[PDB]
Paper text:
Here, we have studied the binding of [VIVO(empp)2] (where Hempp is 1-methyl-2-ethyl-3-hydroxy-4(1H)-pyridinone), an antidiabetic and anticancer VC, with the model protein hen egg white lysozyme (HEWL) by electrospray ionization-mass spectrometry (ESI-MS), electron paramagnetic resonance (EPR), and X-ray crystallography. To structurally characterize the interaction of HEWL with [VIVO(empp)2], crystals of metal-free protein, grown under three different conditions, were exposed for 22–25 days to stabilizing solutions containing the mother liquors saturated with the VC. All the crystals belong to the space group P43212 and present one single protein molecule in the asymmetric unit. Vanadium-containing fragment binding does not alter the overall conformation of the protein.
Author numbering: 1 to 129
Write the structure that this text describes.
Amino acid sequence: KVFGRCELAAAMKRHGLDNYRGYSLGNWVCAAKFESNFNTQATNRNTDGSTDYGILQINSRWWCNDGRTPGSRNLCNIPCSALLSSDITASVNCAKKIVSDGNGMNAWVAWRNRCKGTDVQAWIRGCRL
């Protein structure tokens, strides 16, 4: 599913990301924009042989099982394919663990490089939230 911007803002807010670990909703929407272009089906292989999955490009070395990432963990206890669903619940639950791990949203390198320090409330402009 390709979310609209305000559609995704509303879903992320419903699931508790606004101000989660102190990160306002626009940070999360900005991260999804540059990680996946709002596409839940996005996947991208990494040089280390892991893959990133879904709206927040959650990676198979630590967080989910894809069966092809040797000596990986599954700290979110899900199959990576769960992260591709139109229902973002599993991606949100796993993102909450990731952002709690010690480096905050710096775990998403698109957030660090394209969202951090910018006017992230622009991403929720106009939305009825």
